[PDB]
Amino acid sequence: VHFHPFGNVNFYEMDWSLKGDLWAHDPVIAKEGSRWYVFHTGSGIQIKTSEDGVHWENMGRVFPSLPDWCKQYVPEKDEDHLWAPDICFYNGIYYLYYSVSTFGKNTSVIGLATNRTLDPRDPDYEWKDMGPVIHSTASDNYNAINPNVVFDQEGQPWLSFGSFWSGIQLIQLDTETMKPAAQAELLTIASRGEEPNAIEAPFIVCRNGYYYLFVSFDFCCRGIESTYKIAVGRSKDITGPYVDKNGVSMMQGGGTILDAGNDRWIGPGHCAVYFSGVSAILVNHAYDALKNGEPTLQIRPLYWDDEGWPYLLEHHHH
Numbered sequence: 001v002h003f004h005p006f007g008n009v010n011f012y013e014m015d016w017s018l019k020g021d022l023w024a025h026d027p028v029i030a031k032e033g034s035r036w037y038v039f040h041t042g043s044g045i046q047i048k049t050s051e052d053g054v055h056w057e058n059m060g061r062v063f064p065s066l067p068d069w070c071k072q073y074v075p076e077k078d079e080d081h082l083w084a085p086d087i088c089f090y091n092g093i094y095y096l097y098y099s100v101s102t103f104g105k106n107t108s109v110i111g112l113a114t115n116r117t118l119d120p121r122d123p124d125y126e127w128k129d130m131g132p133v134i135h136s137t138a139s140d141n142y143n144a145i146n147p148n149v150v151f152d153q154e155g156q157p158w159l160s161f162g163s164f165w166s167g168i169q170l171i172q173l174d175t176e177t178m179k180p181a182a183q184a185e186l187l188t189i190a191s192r193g194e195e196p197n198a199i200e201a202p203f204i205v206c207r208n209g210y211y212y213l214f215v216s217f218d219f220c221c222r223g224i225e226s227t228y229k230i231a232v233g234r235s236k237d238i239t240g241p242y243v244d245k246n247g248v249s250m251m252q253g254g255g256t257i258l259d260a261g262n263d264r265w266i267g268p269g270h271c272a273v274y275f276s277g278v279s280a281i282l283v284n285h286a287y288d289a290l291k292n293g294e295p296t297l298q299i300r301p302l303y304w305d306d307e308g309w310p311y312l313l314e315h316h317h318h
């Protein structure tokens, strides 16, 4: 399943000196035609576009206003900022997942919107509100935010999500609804194993016979004091057990650190990983120490070593 398509594009041949409107947190990317799209956290889900992948402009948003049903799930929410979108392309349809929540609480719902095209100029454009996907309340020990969809080796879709509480959750989706399958059960597949369980934002990819689970550790959303980092583990089965490069279980704080940030780019996290041919990129945000800690889009080539583990090189100089 080519659920994140990018064409003949070779990410290792592009110079990723990003320009333009770069302010963002919790970014994902998609490409339709020759146009690239970044979906990120903000009013009604915020959208940027680019004709090359490198020069970005703010383009629009997914919802003019919050869908009405959301209030039932999160009655205390009184603004229209939707969090941590995820995008995938399946059966000719775009499935956009997003989070409705309030900060520090686990009364939350993940919604689904669908579209035939990502382009508002295209007369087929219409984000159909397909309603709720999965939710959490105070009686749950997980938080229904931060969705991610992955396809397993048998082409079955799966949803991972989570933030704090018991950690990262996983549940099988139905291929028709792209919502959790009838009697499907929620599994916890990662956790720091203790309090406060600062693990969130899962992103799963399948490469060379392993599922790789990327996550963010520690604390976002504090500008220049954010302590966010990007960590990774892997499993032969999508249901786990996920283990880091040192063999430590990701259900016990395991995870190899991919990026902990530098003197400029503080607290990198909420990442997404995409492939095109034999190339890959990591997408995330980081808090800009030279611009008042403002969350900033980052896109970098991501390499894989001979043992199958991902790694980043030093930042180029521009």
Ligand SMILES: OC[C@@H]1O[C@@H](OC[C@@H]2O[C@@H](OC[C@@H]3O[C@@H](OC[C@@H]4O[C@@H](OC[C@@H]5O[C@@H](OC[C@@H]6O[C@@H](O)[C@H](O)[C@H]6O)[C@H](O)[C@H]5O)[C@H](O)[C@H]4O)[C@H](O)[C@H]3O)[C@H](O)[C@H]2O)[C@H](O)[C@H]1O
Binding pocket: 025, 026, 041, 042, 043, 081, 082, 083, 084, 099, 101, 102, 103, 104, 105, 143, 145, 146, 162, 163, 164, 165, 166, 195, 196, 197, 198, 200, 201, 220, 221, 295
């Ligand atoms: O930048 C300017 C503005 O941003 C944009 O508008 C919307 C904003 O983006 C949102 O951030 C994205 C989300 O951030 C991550 O998770 C955030 C929170 O972390 C957890 O809460 C943190 C903390 O711990 C809580 O308690 C922990 C649990 O309680 C125990 O019982 C349990 O055992 C513990 O584990 C505390 O209450 C709290 O202090 C929460 O899970 C989550 O709320 C998500 O991953 C991202 O989705 C930001 O918040 C929005 O306002 C605009 O563009 C711009 O104006």
Ligand SMILES: [Ca+2]
Binding pocket: 084, 085, 086, 146, 147, 148, 201, 202, 203, 270, 271, 272
């Ligand atoms: Ca995500």
